[PDB]
Amino acid sequence: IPRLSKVNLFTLLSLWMELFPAVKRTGLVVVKNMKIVGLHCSSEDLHAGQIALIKHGSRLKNCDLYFSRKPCSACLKMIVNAGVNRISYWPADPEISLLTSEDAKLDAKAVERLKSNSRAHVCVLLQPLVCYMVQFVEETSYKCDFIQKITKTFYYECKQERIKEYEMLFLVSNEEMHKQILMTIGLENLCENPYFSNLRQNMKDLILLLATVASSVPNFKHFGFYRNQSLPQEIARHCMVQARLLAYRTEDHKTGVGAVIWAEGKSRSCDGTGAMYFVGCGYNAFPVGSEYADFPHMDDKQKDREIRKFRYIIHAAQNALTFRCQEIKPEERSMIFVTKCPCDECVPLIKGAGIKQIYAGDVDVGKKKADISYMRFGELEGVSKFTWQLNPS
């Protein structure tokens, strides 16, 4: 199966963070050592870069920041003062909108001057997708737990609606307007063909992938996470789409599983996510530092249990708990969103970590295979469980 690249995952996650349920709004991904240490959105008061500065401080040193829009000079100067390594941005309308003009152009010139005289690398890191990536993402999104749960109890129409909305929000349809934007933000190298068309095609492909994944967990009828108070359905859907996006980083050859841990703080913060802050993220993969042939990839079809992948694969929840950027606070409400039902070795870890709520698909609940089982999730106590289903009331 095709795999999403790291920089493309971070770009997609920043674009999705810009859409978090609440000068243009900006989403931001803070990555350290190829691990996500922050997910931020602009608020009505502060920009995403200012929020990242407040939240991290000097911990931004040697960090990679993926913005959904080019940050303003006020944000960029503080970000490079904090000592970040890379600032990747989505080459659309920047934070100070250029589609509104003299102040925005002056801000863009100031950003260029800051970039020219800093060790931080301000750039565009989005890469082309493989030709099969979008088709594979669509195939797996139609076969995901939530779409199938809806089907048993439409998806293409929701996908088309999300395509239109996200193309409006994230792309510049007019080619001359986009050329002007790229000239203003110091991307003149991508203003002439084939680089201009290639950049626009890559952006359109990433937007199509994002719309596909977002439609995999759709706002459809009365479908949401139900069955200790649940989150608003919009935030739950957004976090589940984060997990679904992470599921496409899978090292597994058959099934990708993603997990995101968020927490709800007691006091209101400066972030555009409100009291909620990102805690951890993960996908199913082999132990870090493993080659392609280091560990078996065979499924249960293998006639030898020793050469089955199950005893060596790190699960999405296990990876989210391992590489968490925050501590699970016992007083705070904490949520883990996982694309598949948690297994019998993940549920005890989630419970022991103190995670209060599990939002999950329940397609595999109650299944007992030779190597992996799902009996503990159904009988789990002390952790609220929310599954995709019709609103029972």
Ligand X SMILES: Cc1cn([C@H]2C[C@H](O)[C@@H](COP(=O)(O)OP(=O)(O)OP(=O)(O)O)O2)c(=O)nc1N
Hey, which residues between 21 and 50 contact Zn ion (CB under 5 A)?
47
Q: What stretches of 216-315 show up as alpha helix (H) in DSSP?
A: 233-246
Q: Which stretch binds ligand X (CB under 6 A): 40-48, 154-162, 203-211, 248-256?
A: 248-256
Least distance in Å: CB of 312 to ligand X? 9
From 317, 321, 358, 383, residue interacting with ligand X (rule: CB under 6 A): 317
Rounded CA-CA distance 264/259 in Å is: 17
Q: Does 31 bind a copy of itself (CB under 8 A)?
A: no
Closest approach, Cβ 337 to ligand X, in A, equals 11
Judged by beta carbon distances under 5 to 8 A according to partner kind, the member of Zn ion, ligand X, a copy of itself, none in contact with residue 157 is: none
Q: Interaction with a copy of itself in 148-187: which residues (CB under 8 A)?
A: 187
* Sole binder of ligand X in the list 10, 226, 248, 310 (CB under 6 A): 310
β-pairing verdict for 384-390 and 357-360: parallel
234 CA to centre of own chain:
15
Q: How far apart are CA 334 and CA 259, in angstroms?
A: 13
Nearest to Zn ion of 319, 389 (CB atom): 319
Q: Residue 158 region, left (φ>0) first, then alpha (ψ -120 to 50), else beta?
A: alpha
- Identify which of residues 75 and 353 has a Cβ nearer to Zn ion in the complex: 75
Residue 117 CB, shortest distance to a copy of itself, in Å, is 4
Which segments of the chain does DSSP mark as H helices, in order?
6-17, 48-56, 73-81, 102-116, 133-142, 145-152, 155-170, 175-184, 195-215, 233-246, 316-322, 347-352, 375-378
Angle between helices 102-116 and 73-81 (to 10 degrees): 20
Q: Where are the alpha helices (DSSP H) in 143-267?
A: 145-152, 155-170, 175-184, 195-215, 233-246
Q: Which stretch binds a copy of itself (CB under 8 A): 39-47, 137-145, 153-161, 383-391?
A: 39-47
Helices 6-17, 233-246: inter-axial angle, 10-degree rounding: 170
Angstrom distance (rounded) from CA 114 to CA 120:
9
Interface of this chain with a copy of itself, residues 352 to 391, rule: CB under 8 A: 352-354
Contacted entry of Zn ion, a copy of itself, ligand X, none for residue 336, CB cut-off 5 to 8 Å set by kind? none
Give the residue, chosen from 56, 297, 340, 356, that forms a contact with ligand X under the rule CB under 6 A.
340
Question: Is residue 161 within the footprint of ligand X (CB under 6 A)?
Answer: no
The answer to whether residue 369 forms part of the interface with ligand X (CB under 6 A) is yes
Of residues 81 through 140, those in contact with Zn ion by CB under 5 A are 95
Quote the CA–CA distance of 139 and 150 in Å, as a whole number.
Answer: 16
Which residues of the chain form contacts with ligand X (CB under 6 A)? 252, 254-255, 257, 284, 299-300, 309-310, 313, 315-317, 338, 340, 342-343, 346, 369, 372
